[PDB]
Design a protein around this ligand. Sequence first.
Ligand SMILES: *C/C=C(C)/C=C/C=C1/N(C)c2ccccc2C1(C)C
Length: 137
Amino acid sequence: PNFSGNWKIIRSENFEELLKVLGVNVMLRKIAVAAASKPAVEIKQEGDTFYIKTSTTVRTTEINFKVGEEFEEQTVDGRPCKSLVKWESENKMVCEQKLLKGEGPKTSWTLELTNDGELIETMTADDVVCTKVYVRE
Ligand SMILES: *C/C=C(C)/C=C/C=C1/N(C)c2ccccc2C1(C)C
């Protein structure tokens, strides 16, 4: 699959609830789910090597990884973690995360490219799943 593109969000389900069950305070949740925080996602894929930039009005997040090689990022609540992405199937990657410091809920994410070119993202903490869907600009 080729995940490359500039992706715009078209569906978001259970995001604030994920943050809430994770202990994020209401002032921060409000900011995090406001229109000003609507994420635009740029992906550059070169085979198994990925660059993913997520942009909001106030923040840029950039990750660089190759499938099967450990890399650093932050969990959805901003805690540094060691991440590892594997292909679950031809069109879907899954990332396992390990906190660099301390214990905490089991967090993960996935990205899947559909036949008609939609991008499905999931983010999980224990038994709570958030789903976002994007289309290319
Ligand atoms: C993951 C989702 C985030 C960070 C924010 C999304 C915010 C919104 N808002 C405020 C909104 C309003 C109408 C329709 C869609 C949305 C969206 C989910 C993008």
